[PDB]
Symmetry: C3
Subunit: 114 residues, 3 copies
């Protein structure tokens, strides 16, 4: 999978090691090799959540399968837990959109995963 | 719902109250409490629309239901109105991608909305 | 269509003419008028791919139709081609998510494409 975090937390508040840690914990959570996981963090954003500019995040996780009710709950506990621990973001000011991609609709290395 | 605007309009052209205004207008438009609505504006982008770098916007609106033919036309009229009036972007240089998210595919507060 | 590339390549590495070339190549790949094509490049991103911060990209292409097995393979070869030639990113460090949008789910000019 690939995980993207957009947040109003400033760049200086993103701790060294954070992209690595996200890679490792997503690899572990999905039983996927870490060589396939992509991660992306976008700090310093102009965002509001419930009209407030307190720390918040808008995120996405795309996966070819391994998306569903229990699995997404597990992902959210893991990802909100990381965002709370590392970025000081309340889990109730985070949204994560989950996307179950078809292999034919994921481009990589001049072709797709189909 | 959550609304993201990416634009080549500079940060200084985004009016002070703009995130609050989007929050309140989207709350009114969907009959949702404003506490749930997230909004995110990304200015100064390197983008073109039709090959031109005249002001333009690429947007998304994610909602758990309340997405459909008529609802979406209404959203577009509302959101293009605000982008024209506040950011001085022509409606014919705006795209908005609408996503009807399943509740189980939206993470929040260490779980999902399911 | 609309194509978005997020990359850790620095802004100064993105050559003059890159948005123009993407617009032109996407028009040719879909036979669609360039006047409707939108492109967006986001350099200097904090991203990793396979746990490495070597040059990489995460991309999206949204289109109303013209998405499918052979078409997406063709787009990937085109777009990885450009990202390798112009931004010096290895094709195997690019992901492109493809989205076949329903015309009623794309807003434009105060309405939708339905
Ligand atoms: C996790 S195994 N990511 C690699 C495959 C992929 C899946 C969805 C979107 C992009 C890349
Ligand atoms: C509007 S009520 N937003 C909160 C629920 C939601 C829907 C789609 C994506 C993120 C959050
Ligand atoms: C290509 S012809 N783009 C214009 C129509 C479109 C399709 C998907 C998303 C946004 C805009």
């Amino acid at each position: 999978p690939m995980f993207i975090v957009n947040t109003n937390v400033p760049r200086a508040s993103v701790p060294d090691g954070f992209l690595s840690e996200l890679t490792q914990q997503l690899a572990q959570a999905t039983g996927k090799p870490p060589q396939y996981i992509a991660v992306h963090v976008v700090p310093d954003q102009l965002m509001a959540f419930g009209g407030s500019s307190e720390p918040c995040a808008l995120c996405s996780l795309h996966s070819i399968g391994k998306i569903g009710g229990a699995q997404n709950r597990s992902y959210s506990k893991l990802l909100c837990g990381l965002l709370a621990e590392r970025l000081r973001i309340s889990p109730d000011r985070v949204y994560i959109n989950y996307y179950d991609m078809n292999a034919a609709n994921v481009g990589w290395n001049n072709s797709t995963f189909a």
